[PDB]
Amino acid sequence: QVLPGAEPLYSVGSRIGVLVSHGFTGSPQSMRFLAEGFARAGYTVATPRLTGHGTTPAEMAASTASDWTADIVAAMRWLEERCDVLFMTGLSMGGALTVWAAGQFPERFAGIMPINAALRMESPDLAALAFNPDAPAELPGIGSDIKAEGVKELAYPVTPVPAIKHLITIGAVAEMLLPRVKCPALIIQSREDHVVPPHNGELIYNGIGSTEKELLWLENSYHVATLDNDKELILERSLAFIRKH
Amino acid sequence: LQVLPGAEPLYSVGSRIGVLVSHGFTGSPQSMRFLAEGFARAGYTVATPRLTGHGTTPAEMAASTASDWTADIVAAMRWLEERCDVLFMTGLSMGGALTVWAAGQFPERFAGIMPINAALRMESPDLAALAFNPDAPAELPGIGSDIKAEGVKELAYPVTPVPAIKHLITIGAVAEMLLPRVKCPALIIQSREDHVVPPHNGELIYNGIGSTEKELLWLENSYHVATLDNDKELILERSLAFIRKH
Ligand SMILES: [Cl-]
Ligand SMILES: [Cl-]
Numbered sequence: 001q002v003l004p005g006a007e008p009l010y011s012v013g014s015r016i017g018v019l020v021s022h023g024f025t026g027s028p029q030s031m032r033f034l035a036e037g038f039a040r041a042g043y044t045v046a047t048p049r050l051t052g053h054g055t056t057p058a059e060m061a062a063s064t065a066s067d068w069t070a071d072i073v074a075a076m077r078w079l080e081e082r083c084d085v086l087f088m089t090g091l092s093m094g095g096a097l098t099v100w101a102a103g104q105f106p107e108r109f110a111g112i113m114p115i116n117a118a119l120r121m122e123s124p125d126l127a128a129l130a131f132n133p134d135a136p137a138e139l140p141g142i143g144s145d146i147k148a149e150g151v152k153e154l155a156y157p158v159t160p161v162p163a164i165k166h167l168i169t170i171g172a173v174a175e176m177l178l179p180r181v182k183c184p185a186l187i188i189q190s191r192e193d194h195v196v197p198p199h200n201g202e203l204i205y206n207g208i209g210s211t212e213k214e215l216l217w218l219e220n221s222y223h224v225a226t227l228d229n230d231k232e233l234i235l236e237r238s239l240a241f242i243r244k245h
Numbered sequence: 246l247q248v249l250p251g252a253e254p255l256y257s258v259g260s261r262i263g264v265l266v267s268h269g270f271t272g273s274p275q276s277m278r279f280l281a282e283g284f285a286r287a288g289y290t291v292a293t294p295r296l297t298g299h300g301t302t303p304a305e306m307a308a309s310t311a312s313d314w315t316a317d318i319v320a321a322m323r324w325l326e327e328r329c330d331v332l333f334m335t336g337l338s339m340g341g342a343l344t345v346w347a348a349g350q351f352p353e354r355f356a357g358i359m360p361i362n363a364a365l366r367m368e369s370p371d372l373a374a375l376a377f378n379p380d381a382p383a384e385l386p387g388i389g390s391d392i393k394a395e396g397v398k399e400l401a402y403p404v405t406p407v408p409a410i411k412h413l414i415t416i417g418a419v420a421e422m423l424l425p426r427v428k429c430p431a432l433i434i435q436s437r438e439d440h441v442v443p444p445h446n447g448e449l450i451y452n453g454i455g456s457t458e459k460e461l462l463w464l465e466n467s468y469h470v471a472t473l474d475n476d477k478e479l480i481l482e483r484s485l486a487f488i489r490k491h
Contacts, residue, residue: 065411069377104374127422128350130415131315165311165415172418173411176366176373 005029005154006054009047010078011039016110016242017083019075019101020047023092023118024167025142027054029154030091034226037235043242044082046075052163054154057138061160065169072097076108087242089113091226092196093167096174099204102185103177111184111245113238116223118196119175119203121168130165137161145194145223153224178207184245185213188225188234195223212245249273251400252300255281255293256324262356263290263329264488265321265347267340269364270413271388273300275400276337280472283481289488290328292321303384303406311412311419318343322354333488335359337472338442339413342420345450348431349423357430357491359484362469364442365421365449367414376411383407391440391469399470424453431459432487434471434480441469458491 006027009020018038020031028035028047035047050071052063079086086109090098095117102112121127129135143155185208189201205215216237221228252273255266264284268277274293281293294317298309325332332355336344341363348358367373375381389401431454435447451461462483467474 066377070379073379100377103370104378121422124349124423124426127419128426130419131312131346132350133316133319165419168418168422169411169415172414173373173376176368176414177370180370180374 001055002049003027003054003154006049008049009035009045011045012082013039013042013044015044015083016085017044017046017079017087018242019072019079019086019088020045021072021088021090021094021097022050022053023090023094024163025053025060025159026091026153026155030224030226031094033231034089034235034238037239041239044079046078048075057156057158057160060156061137061162063163063166065166068097068166068170069100072101076101076105085110087111087113089115089238091115092118092223093170096171099181100170100174100177102183103174103180106180106182109183111186111241113186113188113241114204115188115225115234116190116193116196117174117200117204118167119171119200120197121171122197126164127168129161130168135161142195146228147220147222148229151227153227175203175207178204179209181208182210184241185210186216186237186241187213188216188218188237190218190221190223190225193223246301246305248295249300249400251275252295254295255285255291257285257291258328259285259288259290261329262331262488263292263325265318265325265332265334266291266293267318267334267336267343268296268299269336269338269340270409271299271306271405272338272399272401276470276472277340279477280335280481280484283485287485290325292325294321298409300400303402303404306402307383307406307408309409311415314343314412314416315346318347322347331356333357333359335361335484337361338364338469339416342417345420345427346416346423348429349420349426352426352428355429357432357487358427359432359434359487360450361434361480362436362439362442362471363446363450364413365417365446366443367417368443372410373414375407376414381407388441392474393466393468394475397473399473421449424450425455427454428456430491431456432462432483433459434462434464436464436467436469436471439469
């Protein structure tokens with residue numbers, strides 16, 4: 001059973017496609033505005049629901065980084081059916097999957113837009129839960145770090161402790177893949193972010209092999225930027241980035 | 246399954262002070278045997294485990310994970326705690342990343358650690374592109390015996406099983422992120438020249454741990470599998486010295 005509001009978005013338009021990925025404990029709700037923005041400009045758009053997300057925390061507890069990378073591949077194949085040119089964007093772990101897909105399939109994307117990508121969590125407490133034989137099954141949730149007032153994210157209200165190692169793994173693999181990324185990149189990072197360190201944007205800008213790259217700092221959003229004050233700016237810049245690459 | 250000849254674990258019961266000795270990815274206890282026997286002849290209780298999927302077949306290793314390997318280190322820690330009041334841990338490559346992981350994960354538990362050429366950051370795009378690759382082969386060419394001393398052989402698999410690669414990187418990253426939590430005394434042993442794991446890994450550890458007592462020992466005459474190499478004697482001697490003094 002899919003929680004209401006967490007369903008995936010598949011829209012068919014032109015032969016230019018965009019893959020949009022949400023992050024860890026979240027769902028396609030956090031990406032909907034953006035996804036809709038691209039479909040409305042006429043692009044084909046795949047915004048998958050990642051395995052164990054938008055259902056229950058227990059399901060997520062049993063999900064892995066192999067599932068999630070397979071979800072991105074499956075969405076790339078859906079786009080390659082409909083499309084000649086692909087872009088990918090994503091929030092947080094979705095932004096790490098974006099970097100991962102572009103390093104993994106270096107010739108396949110015309111461009112990427114990672115947003116607050118979670119390559120390095122830099123958290124000793126989080127690392128101390130990855131393989132803790134004495135840890136609770138769940139902690140309090142990671143959701144709704146948003147500057148704009150009265151705005152809600154559909155995400156689990158808790159963090160499933162067995163899934164934590166898989167977040168850290170996707171980030172690590174994406175960081176090591178950075179020099180293999182060569183497509184144009186628009187790296188969007190919140191200047192203040194209380195979930196993923198802002199330095200991740202510099203990390204990406206400084207490590208990729210792309211010759212065409214820009215680091216765009218968001219001044220009016222925290223972590224969930226795609227639902228925040230800068231959501232419209234993200235859409236505008238990303239539409240211009242698509243149009244020009 | 247049958248354990249390969251030479252790949253048997255080493256367990257030795259001795260005093261109230263114990264040492265957990267961990268080998269690395271595609272390797273086996275044989276690469277740690279010289280060190281482990283040394284600590285046992287000195288009278289210490291010694292656990293040198295055979296990691297899940299290792300010293301059997303590359304197919305069994307393909308089915309083994311980082312949850313398996315950290316659970317192996319946890320059970321060796323439990324075996325030592327039954328027999329011992331004080332614990333140390335040492336290990337080579339992924340076993341040295343596991344040594345960092347256990348000292349960060351259980352910060353009061355160890356009196357000291359000696360990671361050797363610890364594999365926290367492989368810094369290899371080619372490896373990272375095998376981690377979740379839907380088109381990769383089942384096996385690659387092996388990583389075994391990067392050894393400066395001529396003639397010396399390591400008992401490690403002759404191939405790298407591709408699916409196990411994601412777990413190597415996971416352990417290294419979790420260890421790296423735990424570094425500020427490592428507080429016990431540390432002897433970080435690193436080969437100055439290493440064709441497997443970047444040498445800068447020793448600096449990374451030295452600079453990131455919270456330990457007030459720490460030493461970086463650079464090995465001038467060994468490559469990666471230093472526990473088998475020209476500097477093996479120096480490593481045993483300084484590790485025994487480190488144990489007596491902490
Ligand atoms: Cl995330
Ligand atoms: Cl290793």
